[PDB]
Design a protein around this ligand. Structure first.
Ligand SMILES: [Cl-]
Ligand SMILES: [Cl-]
Ligand SMILES: [Cl-]
Ligand SMILES: [Zn+2]
Ligand SMILES: [Zn+2]
Ligand SMILES: [Zn+2]
Lengths: 289, 289, 289
């Protein structure tokens, strides 16, 4: 009940139990996830004078001098690493046909790496899937940019053959708008939520400091129960706490292990694990050393 | 004036003076109190493996295994202790016909122990006054349950002779709704406030972390002056501070002594004192040791 | 863009750059400033038993015993000190016809001292420009009060020859309403903002703990970009952060130097610098020693 006696943060064990409980008494109810750099943390010339630390990922700076981003770009492309237990929890949920969507701020493609269908993945912060012109918005295949990152140090920078403006991989920089699919799908899942109270929105592993993504939790219908799994209460869970909010100060991997145990899917999960600040600011941080 | 220059927290002395001031220039104006475990703190086999700490006070857990709550229940019933100075401040206010209501989350019956009329007491979290069935809601006299807590260790648990479901004392557990009188009376006092700005709502001794009780302060009419006497600014006083909010980082007993002194009721108060997290979580805490 | 990817606090360098950027792409767009004791900090019998620390600046206490305020009043009048670099930044902005208004809680007249036109200055907390009666509101020249502060220790206190009530300098005390010009002008600048999104509201050097001034930031039109330059995120920037808020944890003087550098006005600024809690609580603090 939304007016039944309850506690805000509570102990991890009770919170995880209440979540599983909610799912058990609400089968055929999908879950929407909203995740950040924290679900990939459990998996881990150089720098040459920048005006400010985040300039490499600033559309304005890039527009005037792309040499620094080009210099670091080679190290950014997604490798073929192993998804965390949490990422696999997303796959597990899909198998049980109970995963409505995953909204991610990460550009490591680890959710896709884990087997999550593209239809259920929303890369709010872009991806390397393609390149685009920062001028007209024209799209190009990944090769165009990846190509230049092989030609000696550099002869020149890829440019739009229609407007002349610079071209870069489709990862959203500070100063750019996010892809249409983001706001458009959220609007769709948003009304979906409104239609159904049996759904859940689980926000995990993000300090909710990057906008507009950080506005998603406050827009969750006040009638839909929201969960936060983060080492600290952040964003809207801190500023505008709701009687039904469930906060779990736990690591995403442990959280995944405990939720699976409570749902009684340990076997299906173990099978999957067997057979099969935000990332940009983190990188910016490492640069400054 | 609600637009006169003022300070949020201010010094204890000025805050207490402003409160007395408000009462002196607003006689025939009752006060509503909202209190927690903090007004009884100034007055102070065992445990056997629980899934989570708060399970003993969780309606769900109880529903499947009441043995642990039965084991601790004997130690919970209200003894005949001495009410704190703050509790007596409530009695003092009643005598002066200036106490509209006391909303309490405590189950120690200390406000009633101090002489506060039942009509002015709202035990939002229940009491041992009676027992009820967690199934149909049927009510039974205290004896039914207290009886079983005398029969050897235990032969079986009290059950509803109409639905068969478990019976327990009327103290609200996590997962249960609060008694009708709570929301119903708050609605009444709420409109009462709306009708009158001469009233005051003083919230004392609670971290405002237990819901729905923790929603009372935000629902106080924005036009009614609210006071918080707590060692820390919490809940809505922290999240949505109002220009007229008065915060007093003081202990409830000291606060009572100082307010009485400022009002000039030391004698009536001394006469009364002469002649005559929340509690559940606190207990849960002690269990874990 | 208000929906373009962005960070809340960000690094000082990027924040200052974005502000200058906003101004460069928004010329003919004035700026409104809201400032506190923090822009004058970079420039630096006795006490005789008070009920509470802030009593000297409390209209109620003053009404019953003005002797303490009279005793300290002599030390309060504005001297002819040198305005800080930040104050001169205000003058600089005026010269560039890009300063719409300065709302200040300070009573040191340093903004006027720096050359800011009175038309653009709003002393929300009063000034020594004149005296007034705390009874009828009658105004008197500064001399009336300053006069008594020369007559031996004291023979009596200045009083209103129309209502008999006490007269004092026009600096707003705790318990008094602010001058009409404050709310009236804010209403004017408020609609002005609504009319224009090219303006900016920069809040600098205040913990936003004194009301009603502390209500200005939340009333800034949600469609107008607001900046906070303070060593700590406070007030509405903390409680109700907005996607477009820009926070700069920097000292006001450094902030001024950096903004000027980014705008490219170093010369005009250097020329000006060449040729040419809140203050009341701070004083109250020093009293207690
Ligand atoms: Cl569906
Ligand atoms: Cl009444
Ligand atoms: Cl104008
Ligand atoms: Zn183009
Ligand atoms: Zn029953
Ligand atoms: Zn007068």
């Amino acid at each position: 009940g939304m007016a039944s006696m309850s506690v805000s943060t509570a102990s991890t064990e009770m919170s995880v139990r209440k979540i599983a409980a909610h799912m058990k008494s609400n089968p055929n109810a999908k879950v929407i996830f909203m995740v950040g750099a924290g679900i990939s943390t459990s998996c881990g010339l150089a720098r040459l004078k920048l005006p400010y630390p985040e300039a490499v990922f600033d559309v304005d700076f890039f527009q005037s001098d792309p040499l620094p981003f080009y210099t670091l770009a080679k190290e950014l492309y997604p490798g073929n690493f192993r998804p965390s237990k949490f990422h696999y929890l997303l796959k597990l949920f899909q198998d049980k046909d109970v995963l409505k969507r995953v909204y991610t701020q990460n550009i490591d493609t680890l959710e896709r790496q884990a087997g999550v269908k593209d239809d259920l993945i929303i890369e709010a912060h872009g991806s390397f899937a393609h390149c685009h012109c920062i001028g007209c918005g024209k799209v190009y295949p990944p090769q165009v940019f990846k190509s230049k990152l092989a030609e000696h140090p550099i002869k020149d920078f890829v440019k739009c053959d229609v407007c002349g403006e610079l071209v870069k991989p489709a990862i959203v920089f500070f100063g750019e708008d996010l892809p249409d699919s983001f706001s458009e799908t959220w609007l769709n899942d948003s009304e979906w939520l409104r239609e159904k109270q049996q759904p859940l929105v689980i926000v995990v592993g993000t300090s909710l400091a990057v906008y507009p993504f950080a506005s998603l939790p406050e827009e969750i219908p006040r009638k839909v129960k929201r969960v936060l799994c983060n080492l600290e209460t952040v964003g809207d869970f801190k500023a505008n706490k709701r009687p039904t909010d469930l906060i779990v100060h736990q690591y995403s991997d442990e959280f995944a292990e405990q939720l699976v145990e409570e749902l009684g899917w340990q076997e299906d999960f173990e099978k999957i694990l067997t057979a099969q600040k935000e990332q940009l600011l983190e990188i910016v941080h490492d640069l400054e050393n």
